[PDB]
Structures are given as C-alpha cells and as structure tokens.
Design a protein around this ligand. Structure first.
Ligand SMILES: [N-]=[N+]=N[C@@H]1O[C@@H](CO)[C@H](O)[C@H]1O
Ligand SMILES: [N-]=[N+]=N[C@@H]1O[C@@H](CO)[C@H](O)[C@H]1O
Ligand SMILES: [N-]=[N+]=N[C@@H]1O[C@@H](CO)[C@H](O)[C@H]1O
Ligand SMILES: [N-]=[N+]=N[C@@H]1O[C@@H](CO)[C@H](O)[C@H]1O
Ligand SMILES: [Cl-]
Ligand code: NA
Length: 448
C-alpha cells in the first residue's frame, strides 16, 4: 500500500491509466520531446522497472514534428486514445492538441492511427488535453491562450462529439490571476479531474515550471452545468506546492489513478529535488514522476498534503476506540484528533529504530529528521539532535495491538518497558496499561 518514490527519473507530465485487463499504463513527457513512450505493469510499483515501448515518434516535417508534450492514454468505447500536444517543424511554438487511436487489445504492441488536431474556435497555443466522464457525459478539458487576455494559458472545457472532436463551444473556466498563479508566467495548464461524493474536482498547474510550479483546484457539483463558468469555484491558495523541508520543488502536472484494490485514489505528479534551474528551463530534463495517496477530508474535498520525502511513503495512524482520530502534532505536541486539515501533521514514516535492537522510530512527514519522542511521559515531535537520550526517547518496540492482536498496533517504549504510547484526554503519552480502556487507548491502525 506504500510507494517508493520517485517512480521514474526524467519523466515529466505523468499519466497513469488503470485498465480492466488488470494492467496500469504509464505515459509521460520525455526530455527530448520527440516521442510518446508507454509502459505497463500489474501494480503501481511494478511500473518503476517496466520497459518502455516507443509507440509514436514526431514527424520529420510540418505538424506533429516538434515539442511532443504531455501524452495521456485513455480507453474509450473499446479503443485506445492518446492525447498529446505538438508544434510544427516550421513553427515550434504553434502548439496544438492531437489524438492517436488504436483498436489493439494491447496498446504497447498495437499500431496507431492519427485522428488529427482537436479543432477549437480559436487558433492559439493549446495543450494538455484531458478527457473524463461526468454522469455518462464525456468532456474535454485543456489549456489554451485566450488572445484577449494578457497571459499564457487559461482553462477550457467542452463536451465531446467523439474522442477527437469537441461538440458545441468551449467555456473558459479559470484564468491565472492570483499571485501564486502568476510567478514567471501567468499560467493555468495540466487540467486533471477527480470525482468524489457528488463533486467534480479539477486540479491544474500554475506559474512557471520552476520551483514556483504548483497545483490549484476548481470545484463543482456533478449535478451542475459544467459548461457554465459559474458552476466552478477556484481555491484561493494552492492545493499542492513546493516543500523545502522534504526537498520537493515545483510539484505539478498531475493525474489521478486508483490503488490495486480500487479503494484509494492516487495522486500522480512530477517535481524536482532541487530549487534553482540550471540553463534553459525547457532543457532541464530532471523532473521525475512520483505517487502518493489522496486523502479525503470530512467535507468531501481532497487533501493532497505536501509532496513527501523521497523513499517510502509515510502512513497515518488511527485510534482503536476513536477510529476517526489520527495521531498528529500541533505546536509539536502529539495528540489524536479527527478531521486533520493540515494532513502532513498526521503522516509519519516508520523507520528502523534510532536506538537499534530491532526497534522502530516514527519520522515526521512534514518535519523530516523530527520524530515522535517522549519526555516526562508526554509525547512530542522533536528534531533528532544526535544524542543517546533522544534516540532512546524516540525508539519503540512494535507490538501486536492490545485491543486487536490481529490488525492493531501498539508501541512499547524502548527505554521505559511496560509503558506504551497511549492517548489520554486526546494528548499522547507513554503510560502503563492495566485496564480495558488503557488497552484501547494504546491500540492504533496504520492505513486501515
Ligand atoms: N515561454 N513559455 N511558455 C512556457 O511554456 C508553457 C508550457 O509549460 C508555459 O505556458 C510556460 O511555462
Ligand atoms: N502553529 N502551528 N502550526 C502547527 O504546529 C506545527 C508543529 O506541530 C504543525 O505542523 C502546525 O499544524
Ligand atoms: N523521567 N524522566 N526523564 C524524562 O522522562 C522520560 C520518559 O518520558 C524521558 O526518558 C526523559 O525525558
Ligand atoms: N477524557 N478522557 N478520558 C481519556 O481521554 C480519552 C481520549 O484521549 C481516553 O480514551 C480516556 O483515557
Ligand atoms: Cl488541522
Ligand atoms: Na494532463
């Protein structure tokens, strides 16, 4: 259920589609911007080592012959469709949207038919076509220049007549006007749609593709007219952005997939592990593809948290007797609490114990190098200073749950044996367990 990031080096604008043939299909922008690659695997982690087939290469002359950008693969009405953007050999900045089609069972080995340009009423810079279905009605969303606006691209949506043709007229549903949307360039690009609880959430990327790259989001009700701009409300702050603490910079151009069991939504995105671009921004090849689980807030909105540290993804721990309440820190004091808005406060990664002897330690996701540790029997999230005292205070023996020895987890203090991590008045402590309540207070679940 956890992932190891990054999923793929030197792959930007990642798109993963989970098909009914029990495979995931992964396409992405390559640094040479010259072809469309594809890989498949039965699991998300499998993708990291799956070999890439080149399914289509740029034309030698004319259209579809430059800047092959941001492919997406979809299965629609028994056929495969690939959406991408391309300029021409003559005008490399006349980027337009194109579609490929294959009828083959396996798209990696099939042959592809070019269905041509997705025509729009305005002849202007267009890219990042995505398709999605709301109440059985297929839509296209994309980024395009509105020439009467002083910016790079705005977001558009339209109904579709077929997978390569819009129906009716587009609606512009967002334009880059907030300060975090306008750093370097005034950009709204990379639309991506996830549906949950009767709402449509359309994330998109904003600002220059540097450390300022981030995700904003539009929200609408699935029952509303998606072609009425008034149905969409823009989030006033980014929903996903650079985290210096975790060394993740300019996360963006995302897509959405689902876990192996189909139970969890997965955020698929790119970023860099450094802040400042060297050379022509466009020529920096180092963006990499990453995966993390999407968590749903009580109000029904998605919570993407922060881009997590490289390596294994962190987990959340819920209480046995208060199954809605999660271990989280606030002012560095550990507690249990429901409906954690600052998600990363409730994410921890399980690492080999700082004090050895087969113990475990719980590293903070938003404060790497900080760990759950006790002091005077109270539990805090504090920075490891390298002292023996800290390492002892931050190490625990994993035990079978005290109220659930099958599925539950308990955490026995390494330096105070017989004292367990337990909540009391919602604050976390290390205390002995004698009573039935004590045992419940000391039992937790990871990602249940
Ligand atoms: N110059 N320029 N345009 C850049 O390239 C476009 C695609 O990312 C974005 O609008 C912007 O970052
Ligand atoms: N103040 N404040 N912020 C809280 O304190 C930080 C440390 O626990 C948490 O990340 C944050 O939610
Ligand atoms: N007692 N005492 N000392 C303090 O409390 C112990 C238990 O939290 C810690 O090891 C130490 O910080
Ligand atoms: N309040 N109170 N009682 C304590 O607080 C509850 C929540 O921490 C614990 O289950 C219980 O031990
Ligand atoms: Cl919160
Ligand atoms: Na996309």
């Amino acid at each position: 259920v956890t992932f190891t990031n990054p999923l793929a080096e030197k792959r930007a604008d990642p798109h993963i589609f989970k098909h009914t043939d029990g495979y995931y299909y992964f396409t992405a922008t390559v640094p040479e911007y010259d072809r469309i690659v594809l890989r498949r695997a039965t699991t998300l982690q499998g993708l990291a080592t799956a070999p890439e087939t080149t399914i289509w290469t740029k034309h030698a002359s004319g259209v579809m012959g430059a800047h092959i950008w941001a492919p997406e693969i979809h299965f629609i009405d028994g056929k495969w469709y690939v959406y991408f953007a391309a300029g021409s050999t003559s005008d490399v900045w006349a980027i337009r949207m194109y579609v490929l089609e294959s009828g083959a069972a396996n798209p990696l080995t099939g042959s592809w038919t070019e269905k041509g340009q997705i025509a729009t009423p305005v002849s202007s810079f267009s890219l990042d076509a995505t398709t999605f279905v709301v109440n059985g009605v297929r839509h296209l969303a994309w980024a395009q220049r509105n020439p009467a606006e002083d910016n790079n691209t705005s977001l558009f949506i339209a109904k579709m007549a077929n997978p390569w043709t819009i129906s009716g007229t587009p609606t512009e549903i967002s334009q880059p006007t907030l300060s975090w949307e306008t750093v370097g360039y005034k950009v709204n690009e990379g639309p991506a749609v996830i549906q949950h609880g009767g709402k449509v959430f359309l994330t998109y990327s904003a600002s220059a593709t540097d450390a300022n790259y981030c995700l904003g989001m539009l929200s609408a009700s699935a029952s509303a007219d998606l072609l009425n701009a008034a149905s969409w409300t823009k989030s006033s702050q980014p929903v996903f952005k650079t985290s210096e603490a975790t060394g993740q910079y300019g996360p963006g151009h995302n897509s959405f997939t689902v876990s192996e069991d189909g139970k969890s939504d997965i955020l698929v995105y790119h970023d860099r592990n450094y802040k400042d671009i060297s050379g022509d921004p466009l020529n920096d090849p180092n963006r990499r593809t990453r995966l993390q689980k999407v968590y749903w807030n009580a109000d029904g909105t998605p919570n993407f948290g922060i881009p997590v540290a490289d390596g294994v993804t962190p987990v959340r721990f819920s209480s046995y007797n208060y199954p809605d309440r999660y271990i989280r820190h606030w002012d560095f004091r550990a507690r249990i609490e429901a409906n954690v808005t600052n998600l990363a406060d409730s994410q921890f990664r399980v690492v080999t114990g700082l004090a050895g002897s087969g113990t475990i330690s719980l590293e903070s996701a938003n404060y790497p190098g900080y760990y759950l540790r006790h002091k005077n029997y109270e539990v805090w999230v504090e920075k490891n200073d390298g002292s023996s005292a800290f390492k002892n205070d931050a190490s625990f023996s994993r035990r079978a749950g005290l109220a659930d020895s099958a599925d539950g987890i308990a955490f026995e203090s390494y330096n105070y044996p017989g004292r367990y991590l337990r909540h009391y008045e919602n604050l976390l402590r290390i205390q002995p367990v004698s009573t039935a309540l004590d045992r419940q207070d000391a039992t937790f679940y990871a990602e249940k």
